[PDB]
Design a protein around this ligand. Structure first.
Ligand SMILES: Nc1cc(CNC(=O)[C@@H]2CCCN2C(=O)[C@H](N)Cc2ccccc2)ccn1
Ligand SMILES: *[C@@H]1O[C@H](CO)[C@@H](O)[C@H](O)[C@H]1NC(C)=O
Ligand code: NA
Ligand code: NA
Lengths: 29, 251, 10
């Protein structure tokens, strides 16, 4: 789906969940 | 999930519970990949060593859930299965190689704040993100410890582990259709999937387009959260040509 | 264990 992977209660309203930053910080490239 | 935490509301809107009709009980996790298709582990449906061989009418899928045991009126949606498709080279005899299955729903599920599909990776997203040290996220309603059960969906973030370390952690034969994840003993932090989390998703949030991709499926491990052991996950991208063949042919 | 689900689903 063109909208896959974008959560209504998070990405769709530009809100972050409490631990997604931990994932981002591990993506070191 | 061992050493995880309660999910936030709507945190994993692609989460699916595979539910046995009679007796009514949790069978596995799973994930929503479109309005009619659910992805899970083959061993959730077919595992002859344990006399497991489910047919479509044995099962329901429950979508939009947070609570494990409650009927979440006006939030969850319950769907019947039209057809199960198991990878034709799924190896239940030896090491769960190609541990992947699809379930087509009888009718499309309506998306909502609580129900939304995850993306499947393409070759480039997989190459970029499936690297040792990069963390993904595992979710499920399975056991909180190796040897109870959670009130609500559990979540844990875990790093992908170097393939030689995965191989050296076990006597089971590993294949390119698997990857492993978890912390090493010297890393301090903990966490793992466990029995009951089978079939649920290992997801990563692409930093390129800010979308969640399902890179893995909870497949196997030796115990739960043991020092020097890791959880093993089906490599979704490596099996994507089969996924696409099934959806293109059936749908 | 599990709260009963609506009979329509069974
Ligand atoms: N990260 C995880 C995920 C799970 C869920 N998966 C299972 O329970 C599967 C289903 C079939 C047996 N099994 C195991 O993981 C065997 N313990 C090892 C095994 C591996 C491969 C072939 C036979 C046996 C359990 C524990 N930690
Ligand atoms: C599993 O069940 C089906 C029948 O429902 C059967 O055809 C099959 O041989 C069984 N065992 C497998 C696939 O190992
Ligand atoms: Na080994
Ligand atoms: Na471990």
């Amino acid at each position: 789906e063109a909208d896959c992977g974008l959560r209504p209660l998070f990405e769709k309203k530009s809100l972050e969940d409490k631990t997604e930053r931990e994932l981002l910080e591990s993506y070191i490239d | 999930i061992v050493e995880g935490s309660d999910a936030e509301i709507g945190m994993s809107p692609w989460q699916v519970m595979l539910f046995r009709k009679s007796p009514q009980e949790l069978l596995c996790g799973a994930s929503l990949i479109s309005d009619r298709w659910v992805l899970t582990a083959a061993h959730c449906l077919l595992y002859p060593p344990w006399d497991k061989n489910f047919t479509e009418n044995d099962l329901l899928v429950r979508i939009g859930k947070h609570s494990r045991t409650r009927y979440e009126r006006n939030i969850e949606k319950i769907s019947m299965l039209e057809k199960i498709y198991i990878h034709p080279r799924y190896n239940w005899r030896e090491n769960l190689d190609r541990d992947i299955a699809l379930m087509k729903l009888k009718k499309p599920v309506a998306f909502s704040d609580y129900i939304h599909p995850v993306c499947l990776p393409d070759r480039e997203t997989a190459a970029s993100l499936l690297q040792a040290g990069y963390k993904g996220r595992v979710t499920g309603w399975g056991n909180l410890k190796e040897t109870g059960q959670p009130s609500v969906l559990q979540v844990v973030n875990l790093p992908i582990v170097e393939r030689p370390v995965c191989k050296d952690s076990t006597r089971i034969r590993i294949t390119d259709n698997m990857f492993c994840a978890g912390y090493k003993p010297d890393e301090g932090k903990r966490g793992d999937a466990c029995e009951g989390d089978s079939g649920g998703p290992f997801v990563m949030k692409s930093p390129f387009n800010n979308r969640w991709y399902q890179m893995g499926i909870v497949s196997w491990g030796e115990g739960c959260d043991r020092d020097g052991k890791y959880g093993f996950y089906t490599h979704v991208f490596r099996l994507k040509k089969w996924i696409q063949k099934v959806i293109d042919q059936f749908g | 264990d599990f709260e009963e689900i609506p009979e329509e689903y069974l």
